Amino acid sequence: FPLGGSAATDTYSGIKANGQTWTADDNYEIESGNIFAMEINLAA
Amino acid sequence: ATPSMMPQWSYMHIAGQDASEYLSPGLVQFARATDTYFSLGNKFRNPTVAPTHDVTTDRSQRLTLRFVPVDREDTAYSYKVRFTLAVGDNRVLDMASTYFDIRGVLDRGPSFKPYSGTAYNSLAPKTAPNPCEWKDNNKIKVRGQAPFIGTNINKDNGIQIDTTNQPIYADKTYWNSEVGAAQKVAGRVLKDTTPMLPCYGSYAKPTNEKGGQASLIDVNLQFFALPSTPNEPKAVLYAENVSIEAPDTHLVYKPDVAQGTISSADLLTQQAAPNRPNYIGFRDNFIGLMYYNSTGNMGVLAGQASQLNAVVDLQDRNTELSYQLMLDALGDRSRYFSMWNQAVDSYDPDVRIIENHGVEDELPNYCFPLGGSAATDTYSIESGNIFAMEINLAANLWRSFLYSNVALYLPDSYKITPDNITLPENKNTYAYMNGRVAVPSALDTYVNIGARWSPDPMDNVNPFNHHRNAGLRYRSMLLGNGRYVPFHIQVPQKFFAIKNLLLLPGSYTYEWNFRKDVNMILQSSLGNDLRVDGASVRFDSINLYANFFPMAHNTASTLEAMLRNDTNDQSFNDYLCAANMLYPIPSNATSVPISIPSRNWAAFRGWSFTRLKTKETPSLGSGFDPYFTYSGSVPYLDGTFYLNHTFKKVSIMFDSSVSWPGNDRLLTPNEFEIKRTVDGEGYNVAQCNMTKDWFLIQMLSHYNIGYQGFYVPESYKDRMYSFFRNFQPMSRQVVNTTTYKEYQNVTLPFQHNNSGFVGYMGPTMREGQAYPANYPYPLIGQTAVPSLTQKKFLCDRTMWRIPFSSNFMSMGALTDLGQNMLYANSAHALDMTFEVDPMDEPTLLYVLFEVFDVVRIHQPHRGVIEAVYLRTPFSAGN
Amino acid sequence: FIGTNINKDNGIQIGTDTTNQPIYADKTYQPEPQVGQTQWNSEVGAA
């Protein structure tokens, strides 16, 4: 596994009055899909 | 069959004559002649008829009688049960089998951790930023992670999984070369009110039947998307407000500018770690619980209607170290019994005498991308070998062994506490012995590379407080893996005079004050003050338990009217016949002037030196002596002798005109020398630094050969607490400190062998720039610095003997020169002086002046125990 | 692998006295050969 556990890009917000709007609260980070990986056969 | 059957039996010698008899006398001689070849022995069966009459009763005697206390008080420092033994008639007890039956709760304190490492979220980067919500400048919130693709997200119901199927709220958590997340994603974040710990120890209690963390009084569902098009619903995160904690963690790089606040960007990085493992459990054969040898709080076995006493206990002998030796001298203590909690203390012989022999790596131990290959091109498919990556596995395992078993068990002098986390100041509780990191450059793979060496700075630490005290291990697991533990003991009886007494018919009483002093009745694996950090052993029920031999009344009558005659009386001796006395060697002192005036040495069969450390040798017998703040092995009543390889001289000297060495036997005339540190002009023996006459004199006493050539004494004469198994001799070489012209020393920061690749001074992480090195100094290669050798004498778990005999042999119990009128009729006065090596802190030497212990219990009437308790060569009488 | 050119119907010049393509019974050999003999600079896709 990687040290941090992600290599992600960005994501802003949405409160969505019928229109996924925004969320002052949040402010421009999510990396979709499980963590990057690295594999070893530590027994063989 | 017949109503007798005897004949029908004998025709198979099933119960009849022995083969030596029915065989024709001619054949017996032939079978007794050719028995070393072609033996006719295993085919003509014998018999085995066992005794029909007068061996067993018919009318009474439950095998294991159950006596109940006729008394009980909870002093918080003892539990004085007063039983009432009622061994009947035609009936004998043989007080060996007289267990007690302790039962009650035991609360191991917030210092108990059997899982030697982490048992919580374990396989994980111990730098992981637990998906958090790093709050901020009223800037409001931020990052984390996620993964449950989904397709549709509708507001107030996130991840679309007839109908839409509209997922549940609580439960959202849990390729080859694929995944490729297009088409919505989601996950679950941690809200910015939960202390964002690392991922290596984090745990929030369930609080949700369907698994997920949640505060029961819960959470906000929140959105965010990609800047590419920031008006259309992207991934959705079900954050929450967990009860995040970590009940095994001693974070070693808490980014230390975080005063007041809890969550902030400068704190996603927190290299956690597993707290050093405390084993906890009861002591070997319960060396504690049983106030043995405290004349104040001492039991009794006096006949009922005399109630005088039958167990007179001095404060000289230690009957708790004279049982833990008799076990060695009778069976094999290395075998684990559980009722007595028989589990000898120990120490992985590969982590006391560290042999850094070396890793076994030659080819790079390599990484490979999850599926087949890595990122690649598109044309007429990777170009060149796969993306690769490496770990020298054989080295990481060795480094973990070193600074997980030896390199962080060092004295709290070579241990810089983590960067700036706040510790307590009482450096004896488990708040300062696990907040102690151990520099990996003190002990590490490149430490005395290739030579067996218990690293110098841990020579003086004791071996038996360790991960692998296999016996700290089979008493810390046998009871249970828990903070709280009910328990049900079977403590034995060890008093030499009351541990085999036959107890003829009578009505004897029985009393014995147990100890409720946790931290003295409860061992440890790191040295603690259990009483302060939290610990207690609440007793609930004590009961005696005796196993009767169902002896036929008409034969027990004989054996009881015959064991009462004056001549036919018992007699017992402590296996460790001694007159134990402790001397207070001060800190940083090289001497121990001892003395004894005008004695009448009559059977003094030989001294026995030793050397304990104070903190951990208990207070003698008073009671709750508070100055006891150790939890480790008790070399005073544990048998574990670690600070034993430090003696340098003994100078026995009688009247004030002599030298018991004697005339001139001793090789360095009458000045016993146990070590020649630098002056070895012909005289040190093994390649150790022992002196040829302090071996000649141990292997002469302890085993029994020094005049016929040393020959690795027989297996059955070096049982555990002996000399030879623990004579481990060792040696090094070191850079000549003044010939290697360029020896510019390099201390423990400044040094640098692993470069970037590993720590900077901690058990931190990879931060560097790999240049070459400079601290391991080459002692082994074509470019090797000139070397000065150094020698050591690790020898523990044994007591230096120096028997009182002319030959210095063991030709009998009453030693030769313990019978001579020069000593056996007149009176002298011993004045010695030992020259032990500067230790460093308090340190009591444990001279074990040896005498003849003996008791002559006898029961003339029905219920009268009277016994003499003489101990010569250092007796008790005015 | 990483050889020189590839000829129409030729293979890839493994390399020797003026051409030297390889035995398509194996010669691509795979299972073995490939740069690593220049690892941390291996540098593939040259030209």
Swiss-Prot record, chain B:
Keyword Flavoprotein set for record: no
Modified residues (Phosphotyrosine): 869
Keyword terms, alphabetized: Acetylation, Capsid protein, Cytoplasmic inwards viral transport, Host nucleus, Host-virus interaction, Late protein, Microtubular inwards viral transport, Phosphoprotein, T=25 icosahedral capsid protein, Virion, Virus entry into host cell
Bilayer-crossing regions: none
Gene3D superfamilies documented for this protein: Adenovirus Type 2 Hexon, domain 4, Hexon Major Viral Coat Protein, domain 2, Hexon Major Viral Coat Protein, domain 3
Site entry (Involved in interaction with pre-protein VI), positions: 706
Pfam entry (one): Adeno_hexon
Cellular localization per UniProt: Virion; Host nucleus
GO biological process: microtubule-dependent intracellular transport of viral material towards nucleus; symbiont entry into host cell
UniProt superkingdom: Viruses
Molecular functions (GO terms): structural molecule activity
Gene Ontology CC annotations of this record: host cell; host cell nucleus; T=25 icosahedral viral capsid
Key word Phosphoprotein present: yes
N-acetylalanine carried by residues: 1
Subunit structure: Homotrimer. Interacts with the capsid vertex protein; this interaction binds the peripentonal hexons to the neighboring penton base. Interacts with the hexon-linking protein; this interaction tethers the hexons surrounding the penton to those situated in the central plate of the facet. Interacts with the hexon-interlacing protein; this interaction lashes the hexons together. Interacts with host dyneins DYNC1LI1 and DYNC1I2; this interaction might be involved in intracellular microtubule-dependent transport of incoming viral capsid.
Family label: Belongs to the adenoviridae hexon protein family.
Protein role: Major capsid protein that self-associates to form 240 hexon trimers, each in the shape of a hexagon, building most of the pseudo T=25 capsid. Assembled into trimeric units with the help of the chaperone shutoff protein. Transported by pre-protein VI to the nucleus where it associates with other structural proteins to form an empty capsid. Might be involved, through its interaction with host dyneins, in the intracellular microtubule-dependent transport of incoming viral capsid to the nucleus.
Other comments on record: All late proteins expressed from the major late promoter are produced by alternative splicing and alternative polyadenylation of the same gene giving rise to non-overlapping ORFs. A leader sequence is present in the N-terminus of all these mRNAs and is recognized by the viral shutoff protein to provide expression although conventional translation via ribosome scanning from the cap has been shut off in the host cell.
Protein known as: Hexon protein
UniProtKB/Swiss-Prot annotation, chain C:
Compartment list: Virion; Host nucleus
Induction notes from the record: Expressed in the late phase of the viral replicative cycle.
Bilayer-spanning residue ranges: none
Superkingdom in the source lineage: Viruses
Further details from the record: All late proteins expressed from the major late promoter are produced by alternative splicing and alternative polyadenylation of the same gene giving rise to non-overlapping ORFs. A leader sequence is present in the N-terminus of all these mRNAs and is recognized by the viral shutoff protein to provide expression although conventional translation via ribosome scanning from the cap has been shut off in the host cell.
Chain's role: Major capsid protein that self-associates to form 240 hexon trimers, each in the shape of a hexagon, building most of the pseudo T=25 capsid. Assembled into trimeric units with the help of the chaperone shutoff protein. Transported by pre-protein VI to the nucleus where it associates with other structural proteins to form an empty capsid. Might be involved, through its interaction with host dyneins, in the intracellular microtubule-dependent transport of incoming viral capsid to the nucleus.
Family membership noted in the UniProt record: Belongs to the adenoviridae hexon protein family.
Subunit structure: Homotrimer. Interacts with the capsid vertex protein; this interaction binds the peripentonal hexons to the neighboring penton base. Interacts with the hexon-linking protein; this interaction tethers the hexons surrounding the penton to those situated in the central plate of the facet. Interacts with the hexon-interlacing protein; this interaction lashes the hexons together. Interacts with host dyneins DYNC1LI1 and DYNC1I2; this interaction might be involved in intracellular microtubule-dependent transport of incoming viral capsid.
Record's protein name: Hexon protein
Species per Swiss-Prot/TrEMBL record: Human adenovirus F serotype 41
Lineage of source species: Viruses, Varidnaviria, Bamfordvirae, Preplasmiviricota, Tectiliviricetes
